[PDB]
Design a protein around this ligand. Structure first.
Ligand SMILES: [Zn+2]
Ligand SMILES: [Zn+2]
Lengths: 6, 6
């Protein structure tokens, strides 16, 4: 799983 | 932000 918070 | 992968 991937979560990216820019 | 929230991501939960059960
Ligand atoms: Zn930011
Ligand atoms: Zn699972």
């Amino acid at each position: 799983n991937n979560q990216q918070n820019y």
